[PDB]
Symmetry: D2
């Protein structure tokens, strides 16, 4: 085989044998297969079953031996540096997560420790991080619009925190690269968060300069909202629904009523119908109270970014008022309903409680779980495989809710978002 050796890139710390011993290609540990599949997914921005990776503890730290790596990670026979660093980010995070399996508090403290360990939480930094959410499968006008928003974020020296993969997860950073270079903002941060079961489907771009691999969707979602100083939401499908519900259920909590921090739904003029309908689904379900937590801004990349930028002062002053950190919103209340890992199967979906009856937060947590199940069914290994052994996932409850959930899901199919 072709052995490509990769030397340590952007500052990985030294590791002990103990830390790397579960990644040896042996028994399974199942840890090796998980480490392998993440690393292949990163080299990849049945197809590659003869790919392998070996971790070697050497004089300047770990060197990676790649056996039969994807040939498009290469530029003129070299591995793009961005992709190098990503391979080391995957090693760092699988390792930390592994030394730290040993409750709400546990989870939030874990999410903190992972992000601090990845260098994602910068001590003296002042608020400027915008989470951007949006669909992986979007047409050209939609894509160009996310590029322009990211350009307008760059011009204002804002940083981007986003998921990984194509579509809306990739437009903003490319726009930002140009907006940033116009402002000479060389300290830009492009954070892509992923988790092992979605990374193959939605692989990170090399332009991402801070890849962090969370252990599951729930913890990644927690990461996103604890770090966000502002959120921009583009049109998307089920995964983007999930995210919106996640944040609205949290922001409707009575204890979060003072959390400044804007949410801006934005998209180009053609996504007007998309937005009237999503906005209606929201207010037809969680209800009217929810409208106050986001705004809609169509056809104006600059107004989007400007709303993030102008909020940074309020965010910052709010964290001083709680005596909270800038980088991690510890005082945000996130109830266990939003943390509980959801494993989607026919029983767990069918056990979802979907009633207009409930307090809007608890209703939002259930729907979050609902959307997450549609995603898992669509893109994840185990989720797809349950939709093969048993056909589609089934859900029920309130007839009023089921009608509209159903409607939104059909719009997503109709609009090619699935």
């Amino acid at each position: 085989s072709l052995i490509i050796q990769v030397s340590p890139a952007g500052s990985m710390d030294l590791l002990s044998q103990l830390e790397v011993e579960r990644l040896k290609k042996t028994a399974s540990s199942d840890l090796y297969q998980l480490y392998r599949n993440c690393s292949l997914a990163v080299l990849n921005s049945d197809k590659y079953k003869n790919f392998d990776i070996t971790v070697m503890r050497r004089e300047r730290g770990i060197k990676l031996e790649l056996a039969n790596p994807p040939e498009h990670a290469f530029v003129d026979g070299q591995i793009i540096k961005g992709i190098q660093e990503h391979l080391f980010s995957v090693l760092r995070d699988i390792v930390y997560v592994n030394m730290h399996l040993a409750n709400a508090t546990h989870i939030t403290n874990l999410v903190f420790g992972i992000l601090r360990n990845a260098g994602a939480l910068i001590p003296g930094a002042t608020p400027n991080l915008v989470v951007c959410w949006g669909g992986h499968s979007i047409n050209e006008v939609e894509y160009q619009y996310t590029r322009e928003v990211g350009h307008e974020l760059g011009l204002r020296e804002l940083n981007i925190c986003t998921g990984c993969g194509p579509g809306a997860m990739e437009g903003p950073m490319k726009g930002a690269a140009v907006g940033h270079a116009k402002q000479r903002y060389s300290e830009y941060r492009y954070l892509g968060l992923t988790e092992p079961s979605i990374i193959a489907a939605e692989p990170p771009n090399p332009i991402v300069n801070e890849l962090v691999i969370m252990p599951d969707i729930e913890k990644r979602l927690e990461a996103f909202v604890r770090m966000a100083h502002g959120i921009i939401i583009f049109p998307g499908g089920p995964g983007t629904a999930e995210e919106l519900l996640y944040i609205l259920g949290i922001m409707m909590h009575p204890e979060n009523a003072d959390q400044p921090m804007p949410i801006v739904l934005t998209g180009p003029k053609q996504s007007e119908a998309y937005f009237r309908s999503l906005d209606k689904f929201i207010t037809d379900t969680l209800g009217e109270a929810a409208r106050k937590h986001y705004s809609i801004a169509i056809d104006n990349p600059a107004e989007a970014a400007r709303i993030m930028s102008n909020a940074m002062p309020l965010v910052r002053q709010h964290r001083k008022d709680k005596e909270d950190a800038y980088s991690f919103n510890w005082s945000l209340k996130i109830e266990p309903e939003f943390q509980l890992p959801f494993e989607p199967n026919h029983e767990s979906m069918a056990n979802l409680d979907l009633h207009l009856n409930q307090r809007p937060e608890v209703l939002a947590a259930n729907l979050r779980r609902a959307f997450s199940g549609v995603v898992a069914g669509n893109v994840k290994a185990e989720g797809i495989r349950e939709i093969e052994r048993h056909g589609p996932f089934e859900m029920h409850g309130d007839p009023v809710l089921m009608k509209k959930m159903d409607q939104l899901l059909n719009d997503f199919v109709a609009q090619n978002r699935m």
Copy 2:
């Protein structure tokens, strides 16, 4: 509107003597004002003025009614700020200062501006191409830029829209994937073109040369490779310049790659140019460039694989990596053309000429086409007595004429 602008370690101190030259007093102030205005506009702004202030930490600039599009939520974009200081810097250097003299002036200007990096290895790619180009050409330029960025190559080009713009936008993306934080985007302009082709703020090294010929020389002395995209008379000028120079029998060993490249749609444009080039300069010319269509990677890869050759050849002439002293450029490439009806009419355009002399006159021919179109003084004189008229042997005149018509036909004008 009144805004002040302070430098960010991008501006040396100046004495009162240097500055006094620049009070709203007048040759110098005017040129410095119009250069600075242009930079903020990347006619309609006659109330604009700028005041150079010497202050406790050096220069502050005070801006009277500066163009609103220079601003993002009411601050001036940092790159434009840097360009205002590059302008000051270069105006002062030049107007505070024999083929030999000219090249030594070009050197001094680039050195003074930081654009010649003593310890650096060759990776600067000169990029030439049209200012007015279609979506598909533009997109191609951006992909080439992306491919140059992925290979840690630096860009040096003119200013303004079109092909002067897309390659840096692409590189920003390719350099970022590559963590090439040290990238260099050199934009060379000159004061009577700057307003028409204003520097984008993404340019992080703007240099104002005295004139077109001095920019041309700057381009070719700093290039370690050249990539030429489809363009108009401006591009046709640059191409005649380099090939003119490259054909000099004492330049045979110079290994700078020259690549004409474009999208698949520009195949006919290119065949038309290869023709119109070997016809005028004769077949021996083709040995000095190549053509790569529909492949942004190959064009950036040829640049990349010649860097070790350029590096070795410079080491063989005990010559600098940053400045090609050893390249031989004859005085007919250097002489600053002020194109007018008279100078234009007067040009030796004759197949009868050995290529290099011919090149240099083509160079001037195309230069006055450009100046006839965009410069103030040109736009005045070709409106005061009509077409700058051209005279030479008639096979040339008609086939030089096809190409000029193609430019128009392709909206390159």
Copy 3:
């Protein structure tokens, strides 16, 4: 009301509330007390009954609030910046050891050592070997001080880094000498690593010139940290604390599995320390035997030689670590047997129970001598150990008669030459 807030610049990481509350700021809290004390000692480089320190979680990270810190930590009303950094290193290391009750015990210890050091940023993965460990007496005459200053200068001119204990005397001259040699050589990435431990840091506080302080949990963990980071070791004249160090490394380096470890050891001093090194060397060979001799040399009256031996070995240390597939910054392949790791708690049972007889592999006699000297130190300068002297009488040692003779002479020399 003298109350001063200290900010970090960089190199304080964020902490969680869990982390900060585990400090237990209370009054009966032994941990906090140990934290308060290490932090007092850093500002002092009992008389300060009312010194207090508070750790605040703030928007930009940790800020510290000092109530009644000592006055000499101040230059015109401001705490010297090296000192401020010192306080955050203290907090970093107390907290990291506290969150780690994290194999085969020997492995747990070395991995703990590696963990503390790595967490402290003291193990730079990319760095080429250039770290020289310097050991030497805390109480030395000006001729010796001046000699260690001049070695430090020669180490600086050759762009080597220094790793050393904390406090006065030979723990201090070399860094001052290196500041000069490094400035001359434009080596701005110089590293002055000062290692200490809670129970000695008050007696031997860190000089603000140390740019990486690390607080290890005990004396044995620091000894290990020194030998695993060392690329080279220089040993100046010293007392029982320096003899401990010497016997520790020689014990280790005589192990056949360590035969190929190329880190040089140079005992060096001014011309007038010749009788000193005559007797030290004879004592090494008398106890550990003549095999000990191949592991060190002695360079008298020549600072440039001692540095040049360090400097010229660095490419050998380099080649050797790659031959062992080991790291540059941390020597995992070096073998250190448990008797060099096991923490010693000096009292009369423990001192009397030492095995000081000739009939044992020298590595093992080394290991026992290491604790003997350790006990002399503790009794001399540590709180708990100064009390056994107080409330019991002086430490009692027994063993092979010829060995006790030379060991008593050595200690009497130390006392005589005012090294203790």
Copy 4:
């Protein structure tokens, strides 16, 4: 013959052939000899001795390389030129070349341009530069005192600007290396100014990190006093006396009355006599009106440094009040008598107006000249040849002044300062 090549790092620009050819080894272009002497003095830090030394400037692929034919080897470390020495060699080249490519106003603008070209005037910088003056020839007690002052300067994050050479010219940078490292002040600045006719007698220490070659003693004096933020003066001989009279003569000008740069004479306890005597020289000659421009701090390194430090915000406020630069005191008034270069011979020395009856400032200007000639005849090439051709320089004037000057100069000899 031993050839050593020198590579620059950064901190040397490219030069043209027009620029280099000026320094080819020629029969005797003064320019080669002077570049050569200057380069040889820098290698000698630490005369027909190195008659077979030569240096060749080469234009090479990364800029200039120097080829040393038979340098002094006595200061090499393990066969290599200490990096600070290599930088000095390129500082000499830079400065010989700049002056060789180049009326009160003209003199000042020249000083500015040489300093500007040398990197020695940093736009952004807040006032923090302390000129230290002091004897090249001093005992261990005095030397140790200068080092502790340098230490107390570094503790306060102040920079040092000084003459080159041994004694009080090196001690302070040595204390400052320790003080700065304690304070983590990595951006420290140690400016050593010098000029071609005295550089061999006072060679730059490699610890200097900004060597500047001024063209003559007067332009160095001007550079000193336009750059300074404060001035410390230690005991010294006729070169330190020259400096003291220079700055006093300047600071008594009516127009310089608001110029707030402090001047502090300081020394160890043993220099008390020296100072009583120096202070009465000053007051007997320039008058009581002189005492107001300095003070005297004996036996207290911290207090001298603290006076400089405490004065930085005052210097800052004054430059803004006079609308002047922070790095270069354009508004300070220096009369032509302080600028005009003085070539010491017997005529020019005899011509000195040392009359009792004269403006104090002008007396100080002629006393400045006087000591400059005493220095020139002790250490300068053309100065001694004048001594060799002719015997000692004869001065005359008001006889009371003459016995005092005579007393001070005899004291210098007595005290080992000549």
